Amino acid sequence: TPMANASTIERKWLVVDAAGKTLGRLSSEVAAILRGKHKPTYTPHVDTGDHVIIINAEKIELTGKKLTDKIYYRHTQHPGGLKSRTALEMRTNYPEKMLELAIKGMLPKGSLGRQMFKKLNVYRGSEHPHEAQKPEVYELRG
Partner 1 sequence: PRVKGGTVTRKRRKKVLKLAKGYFGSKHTLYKVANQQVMKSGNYAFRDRRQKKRDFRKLWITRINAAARMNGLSYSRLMHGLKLSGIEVNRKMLADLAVNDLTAFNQLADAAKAQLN
Partner RNA sequence: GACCGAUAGUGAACCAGUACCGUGAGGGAAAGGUGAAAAGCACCCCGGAAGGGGAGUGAAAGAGAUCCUGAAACCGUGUGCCUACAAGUAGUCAGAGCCCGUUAACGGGUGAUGGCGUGCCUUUUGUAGAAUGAACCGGCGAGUUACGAUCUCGUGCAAGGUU
Partner RNA sequence: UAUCCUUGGGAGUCAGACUGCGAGUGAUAUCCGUAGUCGAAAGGGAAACAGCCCAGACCGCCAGCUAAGGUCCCAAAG
Partner RNA sequence: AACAGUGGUAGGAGAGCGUUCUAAGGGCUGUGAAGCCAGACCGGAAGGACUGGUGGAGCGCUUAGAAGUGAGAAUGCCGGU
In our burial notation (b when 16+ CB lie closer than 10 A, e otherwise), range 88-106 reads eebbeeebeebbbebbeeb
Looking at beta carbons only, is 3 or 132 nearer to RNA?
A: 3
Q: How far is the CB of 39 from partner 1 (least distance, A)?
A: 6
The phi, psi pair for 41, rounded to 5°, reads -100, 35
- Give the number of other Cβ atoms within 10 Å of residue 11's Cβ: 12
Cα–Cα distance between 126 and 130 in angstroms, integer?
Answer: 12
Query: Which range of residues in 60-68, 69-77, 102-110, 119-127 is near RNA by CB under 7 A?
Result: 102-110
- Is residue 75 part of the contact set for RNA (CB under 7 A)? no
Looking at beta carbons only, is 40 or 129 nearer to partner 1?
A: 40
Q: Which does 39 bind (CB under 5 to 8 A by kind): RNA, partner 1, none?
A: partner 1
- Is residue 107 part of the contact set for RNA (CB under 7 A)? yes
98, 113, 105: which is closest to 22 by C-alpha? 98
Residues that bind RNA (CB under 7 A): 1-2, 4, 6-7, 24, 28-29, 31-32, 35, 37, 44-46, 106-115, 142
